[PDB]
Design a protein around this ligand. Sequence first.
Ligand SMILES: [Mn+2]
Ligand SMILES: [Mn+2]
Lengths: 288, 288
Amino acid sequence: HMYRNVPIWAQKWKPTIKALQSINVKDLKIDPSFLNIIPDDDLTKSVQDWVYATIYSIAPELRSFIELEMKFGVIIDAKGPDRVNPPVSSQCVFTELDAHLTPNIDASLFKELSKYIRGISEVTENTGKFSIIESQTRDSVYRVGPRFLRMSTDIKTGRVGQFIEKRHVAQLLLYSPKDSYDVKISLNLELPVPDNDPPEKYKSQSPISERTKDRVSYIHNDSCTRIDITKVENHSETTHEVELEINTPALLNAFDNITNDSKEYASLIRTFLNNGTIIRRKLSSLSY
Amino acid sequence: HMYRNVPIWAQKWKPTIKALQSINVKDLKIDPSFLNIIPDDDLTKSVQDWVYATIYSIAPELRSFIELEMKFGVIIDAKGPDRVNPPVSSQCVFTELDAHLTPNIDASLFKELSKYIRGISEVTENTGKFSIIESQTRDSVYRVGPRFLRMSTDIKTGRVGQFIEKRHVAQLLLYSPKDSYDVKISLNLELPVPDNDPPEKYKSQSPISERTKDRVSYIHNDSCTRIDITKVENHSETTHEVELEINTPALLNAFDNITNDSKEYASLIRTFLNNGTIIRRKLSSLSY
Ligand SMILES: [Mn+2]
Ligand SMILES: [Mn+2]
């Protein structure tokens, strides 16, 4: 899995992702199971299998450009304008052809969640636990033939900080009927544009889409997660975006150690879902 | 909640069920989340909320007769003969008007899981942990006016060991689309018949349904669970019935301590769910 890439429909080893063992946590008053293991719940094994399939798909030489992110919105299907409404009542992977999710929560919950995360970062108990970056960028997209190169300019210093071809490799919709928002898990590739310099061919022609991004990012290094809260202006339609990002280097690293020590990858994935749940449930609790 | 009962649509205090805390388990290489807790998944929460609401709806003096169990089958809906197939791919609470499950699995899978569990009970590591109970009983159902009384005779000594009215209070269906069988959770009451003795009124008249039950019981006391493996002759259609049950006493006891210490209840339901998932995943790995 570390030196080769194999399309999902052709993959055959699924090295086993171990369940947590009844560890050293207060000799429990009750055994967790008759095997004394905690089985992963389905949805977590689903994520653990999808991420693994999808990284394995991609060429090794491309995996450092990976971005695994979770974003909130509402799932909408091909026929109706409203939130889907399958006959289920706890969060699941959602798989209907042409179901889609546009990253976008209500402004007031958006302001309310940002206050809450600030608040948590500002607790004296967590003064060394988050790192906050504020950042305001204009993202201009140039079509070439055709492929789209995303140029990111920041506003506070006209510097041209990021020039990529962003590719969406895969996505999983998690229909979350107990919550006011569903989530989209996206596996993207941020491909670095080569020598074709940002300034010399593009800072003279007309982008086909420009997006201003006002963001605060909370990075929680001990859970390898970064929360991004962003107002984006679609040059002008506005969206409120809430995204959790898992750290690519530690994800890469744990994915290369799957066969020898499955626990690292299985805990990273659990941790990412754990965070996205806090989020999701806090959004719903402000909705009431 | 311990001295009163309120109908599910009228309830208002849902006492918080605490999320596991990152306890003394191997100073983890990764934080569980940015709050240092593990949020319960949505399925486990759901079952948490439904078992609580449903207990609470029952009168205190009836609570000790509660039977809370899981069973294995396929969920069929009102329109068609096959397994439902809503657009979802991980296990979730399913809620469709008139979808039902009949407890029944394939008999070789049955024979293969019951060799699986007896093998685990016979492992040297678990020599003190299971208790096995074989029983053969014939269950006869007398209608009175109208109510259904269930009289159980065992076959190896014609004694009339159990006379009761079984009432189904509630149920929840867990649509399991990664597994070969889905699962029903049933919260029933086993009301013992008053002085109207079994012998003197009914051991003379015509039962409306009679069921022979060949059963093995594996009782795993430290995870407070009992597995029942039962062949049943429907006097004669045969069905193979795999049911797991949480211990009533321990359940009532954690229920009564929910406001003071949530952990006891949270732990028991998780344990229940973990043993379930163990059997359901064992079944599925035998169908392949
Ligand atoms: Mn991102
Ligand atoms: Mn039972």
